[PDB]
Every structure is written in structure tokens, then in C-alpha cells.
Amino acid sequence: PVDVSVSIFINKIYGVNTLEQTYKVDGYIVAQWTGKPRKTPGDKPLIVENTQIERWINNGLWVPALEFINVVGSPDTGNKRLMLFPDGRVIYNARFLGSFSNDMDFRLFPFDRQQFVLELEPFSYNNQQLRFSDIQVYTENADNEEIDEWWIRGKASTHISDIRYDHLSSVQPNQNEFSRITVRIDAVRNPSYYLWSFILPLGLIIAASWSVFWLESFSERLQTSFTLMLTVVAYASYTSNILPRLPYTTVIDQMIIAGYGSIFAAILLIIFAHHRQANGVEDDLLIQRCRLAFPLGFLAIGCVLVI
Amino acid sequence: PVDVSVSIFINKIYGVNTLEQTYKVDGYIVAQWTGKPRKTPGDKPLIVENTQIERWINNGLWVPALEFINVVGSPDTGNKRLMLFPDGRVIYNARFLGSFSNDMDFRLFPFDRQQFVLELEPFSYNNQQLRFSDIQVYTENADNEEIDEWWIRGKASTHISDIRYDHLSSVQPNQNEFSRITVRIDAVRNPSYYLWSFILPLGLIIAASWSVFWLESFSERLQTSFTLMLTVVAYASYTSNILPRLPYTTVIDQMIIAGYGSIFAAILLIIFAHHRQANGVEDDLLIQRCRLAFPLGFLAIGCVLVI
Amino acid sequence: PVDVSVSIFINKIYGVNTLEQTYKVDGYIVAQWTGKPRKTPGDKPLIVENTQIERWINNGLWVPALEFINVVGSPDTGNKRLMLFPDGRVIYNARFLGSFSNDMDFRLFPFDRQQFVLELEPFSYNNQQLRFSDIQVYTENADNEEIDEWWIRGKASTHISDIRYDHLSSVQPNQNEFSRITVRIDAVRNPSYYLWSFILPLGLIIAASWSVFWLESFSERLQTSFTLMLTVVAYASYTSNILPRLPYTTVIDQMIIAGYGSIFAAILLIIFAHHRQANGVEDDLLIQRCRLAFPLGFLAIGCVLVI
Amino acid sequence: PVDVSVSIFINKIYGVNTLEQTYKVDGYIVAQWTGKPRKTPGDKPLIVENTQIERWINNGLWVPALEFINVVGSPDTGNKRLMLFPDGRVIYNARFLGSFSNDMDFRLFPFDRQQFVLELEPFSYNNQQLRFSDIQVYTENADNEEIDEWWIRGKASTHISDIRYDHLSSVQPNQNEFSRITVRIDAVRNPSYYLWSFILPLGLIIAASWSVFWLESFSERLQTSFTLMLTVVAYASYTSNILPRLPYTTVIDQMIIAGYGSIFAAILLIIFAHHRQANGVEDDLLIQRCRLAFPLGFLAIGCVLVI
Amino acid sequence: PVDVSVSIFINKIYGVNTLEQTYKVDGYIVAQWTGKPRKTPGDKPLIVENTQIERWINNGLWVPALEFINVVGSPDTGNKRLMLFPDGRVIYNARFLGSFSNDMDFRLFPFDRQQFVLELEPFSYNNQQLRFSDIQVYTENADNEEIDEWWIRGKASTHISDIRYDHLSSVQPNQNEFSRITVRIDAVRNPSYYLWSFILPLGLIIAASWSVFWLESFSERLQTSFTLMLTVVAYASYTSNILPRLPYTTVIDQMIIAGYGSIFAAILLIIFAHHRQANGVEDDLLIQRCRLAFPLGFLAIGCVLVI
């Protein structure tokens, strides 16, 4: 049972695809195991870069293929290097850029909690053939969060585990318990942009929306809210074109709903005010004074959504 | 006639291309057939990964090309593996990411249901040389629908059949009946985003549009309905930028049409109400307040359109 | 002069790029010719896959390169195979996905019909070395046009002809007439989306535009028409965001022009009615009632554009 | 010093990227030079296609690398051909599609003149090793200009030159004078589309914007110009989402500015009319009659624009 | 410790990706070191391009892989060339196009200043085996600045250093010491475009916003500011679709925020102005004549947050 030691160097996590539940990771893979000792030129380890590795493999170098389980497509492989030691041990080193998949919940956008994950697993060798001895992951992390879209939180979770496959080939004495490396890197979304350029102005609109009740005439009151209705639509599109595409509503998506909700409510109140009547235009001088009702009523219903 | 057992593992279905009628599937293919016995090191099964597989083929190993019939372009191939047994049998294993083709009807968007299909067929060996003995497809699925764009519902449909080609080649008899595997996976669109962020608000717009008839003046009535016209267009663009490109109208596209009409309907009546006359101000002293007619009249036309 | 019979299978025609004048074609190529008789295993036809094809050619198998003349870039090739029969016979079969170019006039959008074209020609061998004996094209077409973007019409036109090149080496008897296969497939665009979601609402905009003359006050007359101007613009953008970009105007583009045209013309009259005068206030109360006058003048100008 | 005769065949120039200052060129390369005599089968020229070309090179055949100096990335190479003649001649022929880079000034869009340029230079061999004897360029196109976005006007510019590099590796006497082929093709943008669908309605926007002065009341003056401001804003995106991205302003970009200026200018004129007074109400009937001033006052600032 | 001299030729720096913090670099790498002398044909240096380089490496030529440390993914390499001199020295020459990574702060866009960085480091050999003697960088450009997006300042700053990794594998003495070349090019964004076409009109918008106070009735004042709110919103989408996507606000974003604030501020004043009381509505004589207070008050806060 070959003991293989692994090291992950995380260079960059970027390009989250919200609809695909996808992100990109640039970094290096380092794999190490000990084979039977051999002749090295001089006596210091021999280095084999890129092209020449396939010719070592053709003549019988055992370089087990380690597959990135949750990678979408096949990773862009940078330089590869084999360092063969005289005492026997062999180290595989290669840089990669890959597209990885993991469950990504984006509902409380833009205040996301996600975790970028790497899962590594031997393509052909089970726990009886190849096992992962240990793994440290290096997030060459620090500084400049305010410049970056994502703020990394942990220093990285690691687990070596055994995954068993029930539905196989026509093999089964115990050949079904492959050993797996799992890397987890926690992150929080940078909410500042969506706050000031989306949350705040949207807020001013909805608030300013309510000032429609400070109009004197019923006529002014009613046709005016049609322009404000027209405003939320323009705002929605502005948001729409910019926000990440998702199959569900975000918090922002919801503020927009409420905004529409504000105005349709206002239309009804304005109308109700007018034609509930004792003459012709007895605008009930109590509901003309839904001036403070609806604005503070919007705060209460806004606060029911928290639990 | 070589019997081949096939197994597809579906890892990810994503990337719907609404216009090209295409979807991308990440997964593994496993194909098994029995060849001539020959003797592997020790006598335990011996593994041939990626690069070395082709080197076996040069020395004459029969590794048949099984083509993805409905794949668009040629798929991203991950690691390949041959597991060669001494008793003869050979197992082909490979990971793929492929863009697949299938007829896709999007008229009832965002309530379309689709089925993602794989078609596999040996490229060159007909049913009398190579035939598909069986195929199982395992969709590693569960839970999290509320998070995903698509909801897979069946656990997968299977079809092994014979495809007959009437013309080619200059072979006569029946080297024309290649054996084909067809995998089918049903899905429903998560309509939640489009419900709350498109259906509901458009509904409120059309609804508040009807609020034009509570206006007292004719000028108010007529001018305000222009704002209503401008709003549906603004919403129309808002919609367009997000909705998928199609060559036919969707349900949402139709609500848009409904909106334009309602307002255009109102314009005509408001004009009609005020201008055929004995008067100047000839508001038929009670179409005035077709306040419940037309709103109710629009809903009736709505339930006929569901026919 | 080697006689080569070719057969094309068209699987999918899609992804027209309007600016580039290009479209994508997925299908299979088949080429057959007779060489010198050879010895196949047994006496059965020998089949050769992908990789192994070149190794046949490295020791001298003649496989002439047939170039897709009007292809943009070089095609994505799927599985390839050589079928070698003992009597001399050779069949080349390969799947391809290619981006092809042809002159595409898009002025009468969305009522354009285009023709998808394939041109195939030997890369190195002229009239006298390689000859196209014949070619059939199988358009595996049928049904459901209502779902697809393009409506394939013919059963595809075919023409084998001789193309002469004037600029050679200065080689002397008739070294210059490569033989060319030309496949033509006619198509018409599905206008259904654009009719109901673009033309129709645009018409309603233009129509409701004319209702400005049913306003009684001049302020309303002039002020309102600015709101209608704004509407045509909002409609223009919505349209632009969706429509294919071209270097010329489409029918829809022209309709947008008319909308701008309709309103600016109205503006002048509304002003003209008011201020060309015999007092200050005699609105020509008939040019006011140009109410249905240039609506049919607009219909006349629309119907004159066909001759 | 080897004489190399070159021929460029331009098939297609398309896909200009305004931001990268990039354009795509499809065509064939033809290179011919005289080597030491060879003895070919029979003795009429021997043809070597694609893959087998590398096998001749391994075998000591001199096929010099000619680099496309100004290509961005490395070209999609189609089929390659070696024609080896018995008298010594060697002709290299290949199809290519590449994105090329060149300086492109886009300030006066859409009335741009651009020139699509090709530069070819041997990658490794200087003028004293490899020299360009002559050069022909063949542009496979004519007619149908009003269908294409760029109108090729000239034929093809050509110049063989010697480029000297002062900063090399440090090789001393004269190994720094590589010979360079420069192909230039002049073209005009098809401005028709932008004239009819952008410039023209923009004019109608601006002109009708000025009609705000034929309004009677002061409130009418001011309020409407806000609708007019909103309209021009409205025009900008409609414009923005469609026009190519640049880092500097175009003709059109300025036209928009002018519209903004015009409206802002109007507001001021309009407020001023009302409030500089001999009473309060003295609308100076020359500044309210800037009905013709301000319109032709823009045309003056307008034709000084052109000079 | 082999001393290697490097030369970077920058041809073009383009296509910055703001979200990815990425830029594209087209150019050449030249690496030279001195080997043990050889025997070349005749005695003049022998040239080995592209394909035949791997065949020289197979026979034992030491061509060390120098990795672009901060390259995202793996670069498009053009032609490769080995120049082998008889005195021993070996020159690696090859063209590249790559996407590179570096921290890019875009907060003061469009007045950001950035710095393009290249990092090179041998992939397998530490300072004691391969050492960087020097590096020359050729920035082949100057002038033509108002047309270019970025204004280059330096002619490239460079610094060669020794990087040691704390977390290695099996090495004990001090062999953890790879030598790194760091290339820096300082740059300016040309802000003129965003000045005239985004800053200016946004400014005219905010300015005319203040003209709301030159309205006479309260209904016009309050009702008009609703249209102006809509204008800024309309401006926002305009802007955002065009401005580069970032995870933070730019200056321009903040100008937008200010517009909303200005208008929302105007709303409160106009209403506050109105229910002000000693009666029902006594218009406070000068607080509505903050017609010029608020604008220069906006100019004052405009100048304070700059500090």
C-alpha cells in the first residue's frame, strides 16, 4: 500500500460562476512517495521536467495519476517536474489552473458564505494500492482584502478520508475504498460595493417613494406614483444587468419586490382615500395621513423577514 | 459479435444553451468486453493509464471507438484507463466533459421541463461485430434543489436499440445496423427567480395600470396611460436583458404582450369615452368607471389564453 | 486521375454569426477511392481508428487532404477511420464540427432567408490527379420547425465543378483546375418571436402615438409628445439590446426610424397648428383633426417602400 | 543568402476588436526557395502534406520558420504542404487564420479609415542567411460592398524592407538585419448603418428638444426640459450598449455631449428669461424667442465643429 | 551555479481584466547561458527551431524551464528557437503571449495608476544550480499617448532577488533558494474619455437638479424631483453597463451616490419647505431661495471628501 504525501499551494481563487456553482484555482500539486532505490547521475536527485517525464513513464516509471475529483473539464497543466532521489523517493511537481465545482448557496447575496473546495483522489489505485499519507495546504494568504472581491477566512481545512464505491466494475474483494484528500477554504463576499451602489440608493428611492403622500391633490398623488412605479423598473434593470445570474431571488432582488410592493400599496391607499366618500372627493383626512403609517409600516414588515 | 457492457456516471449537468439547444455533461464512461486471455505481471489485473494506452493500441490491442452520437464538437477527455485482466476481459474507463445536442422546447418558460440525453454508438463496428449487452446510468444525486438551476426528477431512462442506416458504403448485407445506447434524464426549471422577480412585479404593473380609470380628468386619464406605456417598455427592456434568447415567445414574453394591449386598450376607451359626442366632454356617463369591467375583462381574456 | 466519391451528412446547422457572416456545421465526411489491391487480415475489410491512421500513412498510405474551402479556421474533428478493403478500395470517414463562411445579406431581418454553403476541394491535387466522381448530401432533417431558429427548406443543392486558378508556378499544360464540390442548403428565419414581441408592440407604440391629437389643450398636445418621444427611445434600446448587430439597417431598424419620424413630424404640426395664426389662439381646428389624416399617410409611405 | 519568394492570399478580413486594436485574417501562405537538387519518385515533383512534413525536417530538410510579426497569439494553421521539386525547388504552402495587431485610430467613428496590416519576417535567419526575393498579395474579393461592414478600397500595399535590431543577444558585425515583408490593405467603415439609425434620430432628438421654447408658460418650459434631459440620457445607453468600446471619445460620443449641453443651456436661458426683470414677469421676448436663435446658435458651434 | 542572462521584449500590454486583476502580455523571452563547447556544421552557430528542440532535449540538451510565476494559466508560446554556438553558450529564443496576475487597486478609477508586473523563476533549479546574472527589458514603445488608454511612465524597473520557501520537501543544507527576476512597468490611465463623457454629463445632471428650486408651485417642485430621481437612476444603468466591473465603488460611483443624495436632499427640503407652519403652508421666504446655497454647499462637500 504505497504511502503518498501531498502538498497543495493555493495561488489564486477567482472567477466564481454563480449559475454554474464554479470557481477557478491556480496552484501547484506536490506528490511524494518512495519507490525502490536506483542509480542517479552523480548522486544528487535527478530532475525531469515536462516532456521527458512521459519517456520515463514509457520505460516503466510508476507515476500514479491523481485526479481532481470536482474539477469541471480537465485542468490546464503548467510545468511538470519529476525529482528522482537515490534513496528511492519520488516527487511529482506540477502547476495547475482548474475550474472546480462545489455547492454554492447565493441566497443571502451579497453577504454570501462559500467554501472553495479541492478533492483529490487516485484514478486507478484503491486504498490497498495507493493511500494518502498526509496533506498540508498552503494558502499564501494575507492583506489587501478591501481590494479583493473575496475575503478568505480560515487558513484552510484538510481531511484525508476513504470513499467507498458501491456500483463498480466486476471487481469487489475489497477494491472499492479509494482514499481522498479534501481541502476547504472558507470565504466571505466583499459586500461594500453592493451596499453603497445598490442597497443604499434603492433605499432612498423607496423612502422617497413615500413622499408621494405629501402631495396635496388626489390627482397629483395618483399620477405621481406612476412615475415612481416607472422608477423602480429602471432601477431593477440597472441592478439586473449587473447582478450575478441566479435561479432564486437575492436580498437585493427582494428589496426590489418590496419597492414595487410599496408603490402598488400606495396606489391602493391613494385611490381608497379618494373614492371612499361622503361627497365626491372626500379624501379621508385620516388616510391622507397614511404619511407615517406606511413608511413605518414598511419597517415592521421589513423586520418580520429576519427570523 | 462482441458483447460490451456500458456504464455512464453523471457528475454534472449544467450550461443550458437555449438557442443552440445544448447542455454540457461531466461524467465517466466505463466499457467492458472480453478479449483473448494473456498474462499480466503476477497475474493480478494490470492498469494502463492515459499515455500508455495508445502504446498498447500500436501493438494491436483492440480498443473500439464508442462515439457520442449527439455531442457537439468532441468532448473534453479526462484521465483514461485500461484495466487488462489475464483471463482476457478489458475495461475502458475515461472521464468526459461534453456539450450535447437534443431537441429542447422553451415555449413554456420558465415552466419548461426538459430531458438531457446521451447517445452512444460504436463508430465503426456494427451490431454484428460490436453490440451493447447492457447499460446502467447512475445519477449521483440528492437534496439541494432549492439551490440549483435544474431539478432532476427521474433516476434515468435507458434504451438500447439498433439504428439502421439505409445508405452508405458499398457493403450490402446488413453492416448497417449499428447498436446504440440512449440515456435520458428528466429535469424541471427552478421557476422561483422568474416567479418573484419577473411574474409578480409585471403583474403589479398591469394591475396598477388599471388604476388609470380612477382618474377624474380626461387629460389625467389619457396622459397617465402614456406613462403606463413607457413603463411596460422599460420593463420590457429590463426583462430582455436577462431572459434567454429564443426564436419563439415565452409565457413571460406573452405577459409583456398582454401588458401592452391592456394599456393600448385603455387608451382607445379613454379616447372613445371622451370624443364621440353631442358635447365635448361626452364621458358616457357610466363607462367612466369600467373600473371593474376591464380589469375583470382582462382576467377573462387571460383564462381563455390558457386554452 | 483518382476518382473520389464523397458523401456529406449534415447533423446540425446552427450558431449564425451575423457580423462575421458565418455559421456552424456538425456532420460527417465520407471519401472513397480505389488504390492498388492489398492484403488485409483474412480477406476481410480492415478497419483503422484515429491514432492508427497516421501510422499507416507514415509507411506510404495515400490519404489526400480534402480542404473545406469556405471554412473559418480549422474544423473540430471527432473520430476518424480508414476502411481498407482487399480489392484496392479505401474509405475515409470522420466526424467534423466546422465554422463556415458565406455571403449573408441580413437586410430583410427578421424575414431573411439565407443559404448555408459547403465547399470542398483537394488541398494539393489538381483536376488531373484527384477527381470528384460524385457527391450526395444527407440532410437528416425533419419536423418541429416551430422550435428551431431556422427553417431548412430544400433537400440541399449540390454541384461538382472545376475551379481554375490563374496564379501558379509557371507550370505549363493544364496543372491548374482543382475539382470542387459545392453543397447549398437553403433556409428561412423563424420570424415568429420578432413579429409578436417586436413588430406588434412597436406598432402599438406608433399607433398610440397618434392619439396625441385627441388631447385638447396645446400644452398637453406638445408636452405629452415629448413623453412619447422618450418611449420610442426606450423601445429603441430594448430592441438594440436583443437584435443582431449588423452594418446596415433592418426592417425593424427602419420601423424604429418611422417612430422617430412619426413623432417629430407630429411635433412640427402641433406647433404649426398653434402658432400660425390669425390672432394667437386659432388652432387650425382641422389640422388638429389630422387625427386620422397621416395615419393612412403613414400606411401609404409604408406600402410604397416595396416598389 | 537564400532567396525566398512569398505569396499571400487573403481570404477574409473580419472580426475587428476595437479595444485590442485587432483584426482577423484568413488566408494562405506560399513560400518558395531553391535548395540543393533532390531525386523524387519518378522525377516530377513530390508532394508532402501536413504530418509527414515533420518527418522530412527530422531528416534534415530545411524549412525555415517565417513569423507573423504582428499576430496576437499564434495562428490557427490549417493544412500544410511541402512541394519538393527535383531541380532543387522547395515550396511551402499552408492556410492560416490569425488575429493581427495594428495601430487603429477610432476617434472619428463611424467615419473611420483603417488599414489592415500583415508583417512577416523569418524567426531565426537574418538577411544574410535568408532574404525575401519578392512578394505578391492576392485579395480574393470584389462587389457586394454595401453588404460588408468594411469596404476595401485600395488593392494591397507591399514593401520588402530590412529591420535592424540594435539590441540583440550580443552578436556583433551584421547579424541584425532580418528582412521584413509588410502587407497593408486600406479600408473604410460602412457608415450607412450608423447614419440612418444613430445620427439621424439623434438629430431629431436634439431638434425637437429645442421646441421647448414654443411652450407658453414658465412651468411648461422647465419641467419639460427635464423630460428632455431624461430623453437624451435615454438615448446614450441605447447608444452605449451597442457601440464599440474605446478609451477616447468618438464623433457620436461628442454628439451626445452636445445634446447634454444643449439641454443644460436651455434650462439656464429659460430660468434667466423668467427672473431678470423689470417687474417679475417680463419674459424677455427676445430670449423666449430664442426659438430660432438657439437652434441656429447650435449649428454655428456645430459647423465650427468640423473645421 | 549556471549563470543565466534573460531578456524580455514587451510588444503590447493590453486587455486588463479588472475583476480578475489580470493583464495580457505579448512579447519575447530570451535566455542565454554558457554550456560545454560543441561541434557545429562548418563552425558557424547552428539554429534549432520549434519541433527539433524537443529532439535535442531528448538527446540530453539542458534547456531549463523558466516559469512565469505570476502567469494565470499557461501562456501561448509562438516559435521556439535554440541557437547553439560552438564555444558552448546556448540561447533559448521564443515568442510568448500570456495572461499575467498582479494586485490592481481600481478605487480611484478613472484616475487609477497601475503597475504591470512580470515574475520569472526557474521551475526546478535553485540558485545554486541556476542563477540569474542579469535581465534586460525592452519597452519598444513611446509617444502616441492620447490615443492609448494607458500612459507608460518608466522604461521598466527590474530587480533580481533570491526567494526561499519555508515549507519544502526533503532538503537540508540551504537548497531552497530559487532566484527570481521581477519586472515592473508603471502606468497611467488616460482619464479624458471618462472625464468628458461620464464626469461632464453626470455633472450637468446634478447641476440641473438644483434648478428644481427655481420652480414656483410646491406641486411642480416636488413632482419634478421625482423625474430627476428617475434621471439619475436612468444615468446609473447607462454608466454601469459600460464602466468596468469591480468589487468596490469608484469615484464615479460616488458621484452617482451624490446625485441620489442631492435629489433625496432636495425632496426633504421641498417638503420641509412646505408644511413649515404658522398656518397650513406659509412658504418660508428664503429657505426655498437656497437656490444657490445648496449648489455651492454641494461644491463644498464635493471638495471635502476629496481630502
Q: Are residues B152 and B202 in the same domain?
A: no
Those residues whose C-beta lies under 8 Å from the C-beta of residue E35, and which sit 6 or more positions away, are E62, E88, E89, E90
Signed CA dihedral, D99, D105, D107, D111: sign only:
negative
Residue B20 φ then ψ, to 5°: -80, -15
The set of long-range contacts for C291-300, using a CB threshold of 8 Å and a minimum separation of 24, is C291/C210, C291/C213, C291/C214, C294/C210, C294/C265, C295/C207, C295/C210, C298/C206, C298/C258, C298/C262
Report d(CA C60, CA C62) in Å as an integer.
6
Those residues whose C-beta lies under 8 Å from the C-beta of residue A80, and which sit 6 or more positions away, are A49, A50, A53, A92, A93, A94
DSSP D129-170: TEEEEEEEEEE---S-GGGSSEEE-S--EEEEEE---SSSSS
Q: Are residues B204 and B171 in the same domain?
A: no
Out of C79, C208, C220, the one facing B67 most closely (by C-beta) is C79
- Residue D151's CB is within 10 A of a number of other CB atoms, namely 14
In chain C, what are the helix, strand and coil shares in percent, each to the nearest 5? 30, 30, 35
CA angle D248, D302, C248 (to 5 degrees): 60
Look up residue B258 and give its DSSP letter: H
Question: Which residues from chain B sit within 8 angstroms of residue C241, using beta carbons?
Answer: 237, 240-241
Q: What is the tally of helices (H) and strands (E) in chain B?
A: 6, 11
Report d(CA D38, CA D20) in Å as an integer.
46
Question: Which residues from chain C sit within 8 angstroms of residue D138, using beta carbons?
Answer: 167
Cross-chain residue pair A91–E169, CB shorter than 8 Å: yes
Report d(CA C156, CA C186) in Å as an integer.
7
Signed CA dihedral, D219, D222, D226, D228: sign only:
positive
Substitution target from C7, C97, C204 for chain B, most B beta carbons within 10 A: C204
Report d(CA E281, CA E279) in Å as an integer.
6
Bridge partners of residue B25, in order along the sequence: B13, B98
E203, HSE (Cβ side, Cα atoms, 13 Å) = 12
Those residues whose C-beta lies under 8 Å from the C-beta of residue D224, and which sit 6 or more positions away, are C223, C226, D212, D215
Q: How far is CA D28 from CA D10, D77, D94, D234, in A?
A: 7, 9, 5, 47
Question: Which residues from chain E sit within 8 angstroms of residue D262, using beta carbons?
Answer: none
Cross-chain residue pair A233–B228, CB shorter than 8 Å: no
Out of E58, E74, E103, the one facing A78 most closely (by C-beta) is E74
Q: Are residues A184 and A231 in the same domain?
A: no
DSSP chain E: -EEEEEEEEEEEEEEEETTTTEEEEEEEEEEEEE-S----STTSPEEEETHHHHHHHHTT-----EEETTBSS--EEEEEEEEE-TTSEEEEEEEEEEEEE-----TTTTS-EEEEEEEEEESS--TTTEEEEEEEEEE---S-TTTSSEEE-SS-EEEEEE---SS-SS--SS----EEEEEEEEEEE-THHHIIIIIHHHHHHHHHHGGGGG--SHHHHHHHHHHHHHHHHHHHHHHHTTSPP-SS--HHHHHHHHHHHHHHHHHHHHHHHHH-SSSS----TTGGG-TTHHHHHHHHHHHHTT-
- Residue E39 belongs to domain with CATH number: 2.70.170.10
- Residue C233 belongs to domain with CATH number: 1.20.58.390
Instruction: Please tell me the distance in Å from A230's CA to the nearest CA on chain B.
Output: 5
Instruction: Please tell me the distance in Å from E42's CA to the nearest CA on chain A.
Output: 30
Would you state the cell numbers that stand for residue E193, as one nine-digit string? 474619455
Look at the block and give the residue holding cell 501536413: D50
Report d(CA B30, CA E78) in Å as an integer.
38
Q: Are residues A261 and A141 in the same domain?
A: no
Look up residue A196 and give its DSSP letter: I
Report d(CA E156, CA E134) in Å as an integer.
14
- Residue E71's CB is within 10 A of a number of other CB atoms, namely 21
B168 closest CA partner among C180, A81, D15, C140:
C140
Residue D151 C-alpha from the chain's centroid = 11
Cross-chain residue pair C253–D197, CB shorter than 8 Å: yes
Question: Which residues from chain A sit within 8 angstroms of residue B149, using beta carbons?
Answer: 19, 247
Q: How far is CA A61 from CA A58, A92, A178, C269, E59, in A?
A: 7, 12, 22, 89, 19
Question: Which residues from chain D sit within 8 angstroms of residue E95, using beta carbons?
Answer: 67, 74, 123
Question: Which residues from chain B sit within 8 angstroms of residue A170, using beta carbons?
Answer: 32, 89
**List of E strands, chain C:** 2-17, 22-34, 46-49, 66-68, 76-84, 89-101, 113-122, 130-139, 150-152, 157-162, 179-189
Residue E276 φ then ψ, to 5°: -10, 105
B12 closest CA partner among A103, E64, D284:
A103
Q: At what angle do helices E218-240 and A200-209 cross, to 10 degrees?
A: 160
CB pairs under 8 A between D and E: 136
Would you state the cell numbers that stand for residue B143, as one nine-digit string? 437534496
Q: Are residues D212 and D222 in the same domain?
A: yes
Cross-chain residue pair B207–A73, CB shorter than 8 Å: no
Question: Which residues from chain A sit within 8 angstroms of residue B148, using beta carbons?
Answer: 21, 247
Instruction: Please tell me the distance in Å from A151's CA to the nearest CA on chain B.
Output: 22
Q: Are residues E253 and E157 in the same domain?
A: no
Query: Residue C179 corresponds to which amino acid?
Result: S
Q: Longest Cα pair distance anywhere in chain B, in angstroms?
A: 109
Would you state the cell numbers that stand for residue E287, as one nine-digit string? 429657505
Look at the block and give the residue holding cell 413630424: C265
Q: Are residues D165 and D199 in the same domain?
A: no
Q: Are residues C179 and C199 in the same domain?
A: no
Look at the block and give the residue holding cell 488593392: D155
Would you state the cell numbers that stand for residue C215, as one nine-digit string? 388631447
Residue B237 φ then ψ, to 5°: -65, -45
Look at the block and give the residue holding cell 496533506: A135
Q: Do C132 and C181 meet the contact criterion of CB atoms below 8 Å apart? A: yes
How are beta strands A89-101 and A150-152 bridged, if at all?
unpaired
Which H, E and C letters describe D203-260, residue by residue? HHHHHHHHHHHHCCCHHHHHHHHHHHHHHHHHHHHHHHCCCCCCCCCCHHHHHHHHHH
Look at the block and give the residue holding cell 389624416: C293
How are beta strands B2-17 and B130-139 bridged, if at all?
parallel
Report d(CA A174, CA D37) in Å as an integer.
67
In chain D, what are the helix, strand and coil shares in percent, each to the nearest 5? 30, 30, 35
B29, HSE (Cβ side, Cα atoms, 13 Å) = 24
Residue E173, burial from CB neighbour count under 10 angstroms (0-12, 13-18, 19+): exposed
Residue B252, burial from CB neighbour count under 10 angstroms (0-12, 13-18, 19+): middle
Q: Are residues B215 and B88 in the same domain?
A: no
Q: Do D178 and D162 meet the contact criterion of CB atoms below 8 Å apart? A: yes
Q: Are residues C60 and C199 in the same domain?
A: no
Question: Which residues from chain B sit within 8 angstroms of residue A274, using beta carbons?
Answer: 214
Instruction: Please tell me the distance in Å from C302's CA to the nearest CA on chain D.
Output: 17
Would you state the cell numbers that stand for residue B99, as one nine-digit string? 456539450
Helix (H) or strand (E) run with residue D96 in it: strand D89-101
Helix (H) or strand (E) run with residue A8 in it: strand A2-17
Report d(CA A67, CA A119) in Å as an integer.
9
In chain A, what are the helix, strand and coil shares in percent, each to the nearest 5? 30, 30, 35
Cross-chain residue pair B207–A171, CB shorter than 8 Å: no
Look at the block and give the residue holding cell 371612499: A276
Out of C72, C249, C253, the one facing D97 most closely (by C-beta) is C72
A149, HSE (Cβ side, Cα atoms, 13 Å) = 15
Asked which of A168, A190, A212 is the last residue of a domain, the reply is A190
CA angle C10, C11, C12 (to 5 degrees): 105
Q: Torsion over CA of B236, B238, B244 and B245, rounded to 10 degrees? A: 50
Q: Do A101 and B12 meet the contact criterion of CB atoms below 8 Å apart? A: yes
Those residues whose C-beta lies under 8 Å from the C-beta of residue D268, and which sit 6 or more positions away, are none
Cis preceding-peptide flag for D110 (omega within 30 of 0):
yes
How are beta strands E2-17 and E130-139 bridged, if at all?
parallel
Asked which of A190, A222, A241 is the last residue of a domain, the reply is A190
Residue A234 φ then ψ, to 5°: -60, -40
Q: Do B191 and B16 meet the contact criterion of CB atoms below 8 Å apart? A: no
Would you state the cell numbers that stand for residue B34, as one nine-digit string? 472480453
B185 closest CA partner among B23, B15, B17, B20:
B23
Cross-chain residue pair E205–D229, CB shorter than 8 Å: yes
Would you state the cell numbers that stand for residue C276, as one nine-digit string? 400660425
Report d(CA E153, CA E176) in Å as an integer.
35
Asked which of C168, C190, C212 is the last residue of a domain, the reply is C190
- Residue E285's CB is within 10 A of a number of other CB atoms, namely 7
Report d(CA D121, CA B209) in Å as an integer.
68
What is the length of chain D?
A: 307
Q: Do B294 and B267 meet the contact criterion of CB atoms below 8 Å apart? A: no
Q: Are residues A105 and A136 in the same domain?
A: yes
A210 closest CA partner among A298, A303, A304:
A298
Three-class secondary structure of residue A303 per DSSP: helix
Look at the block and give the residue holding cell 478580413: D13
Report d(CA E237, CA E220) in Å as an integer.
26
Residue range(s) defining the domain that contains residue D12:
1-190
Q: Are residues A45 and A144 in the same domain?
A: yes
Q: At what angle do helices E251-275 and A200-209 cross, to 10 degrees?
A: 20
Instruction: Please tell me the distance in Å from E146's CA to the nearest CA on chain D.
Output: 8
Resolution in units of Å: 3.6
For chain E, the chains sharing at least 3 beta-carbon pairs closer than 8 angstroms are A, D
CA angle C76, C77, C81 (to 5 degrees): 180
| Domain total in chain D | 2
Helix (H) or strand (E) run with residue A49 in it: strand A46-49
C152 closest CA partner among C166, C138, C168, C167:
C138
Q: Which residue of D has its CA nearest to C75?
A: D78
Out of A144, A200, A227, the one facing E257 most closely (by C-beta) is A200
What is the length of chain C?
A: 307
